[PDB]
Design a protein around this nucleic acid. Structure first.
Length: 96
DNA sequence: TGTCAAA
């Protein structure tokens, strides 16, 4: 009957191996995830932590189960990417 | 390592 380009069709399109479909999925959340990670890193590291959050999701989205909306899963990766960055530099005297 | 309520 009818269809809309929600995150539901766009996430399934990336599981079909379409990388360009993921680029539109990045543009969809790039401003919303930058507002989430800015809560854990200064503005000078936001664009670098956001770009690492989408690349980690790109190769882990093939394991997405759809147990919740796509942003619920993106939110957990984005906060953990920004928090894993704070311990990647805080271990400078805990690993050597 | 993964990350899955609704945001």
């Amino acid at each position: 009957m009818s269809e809309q380009l929600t995150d539901q069709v766009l996430v399934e399109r990336v599981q079909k191996g379409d990388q360009k479909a993921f680029n539109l999925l990045v543009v969809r959340y790039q401003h919303k995830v930058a507002s989430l990670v800015s809560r854990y890193v200064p503005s000078g590291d936001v664009p670098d932590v956001v770009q690492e959050a989408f690349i980690k999701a790109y190769r882990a989205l093939d394991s997405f189960r759809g147990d919740s909306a796509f942003y619920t899963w993106l939110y957990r990766i984005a906060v953990n990417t920004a928090k894993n960055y704070l311990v990647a530099q805080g271990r400078r005297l805990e690993l050597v």
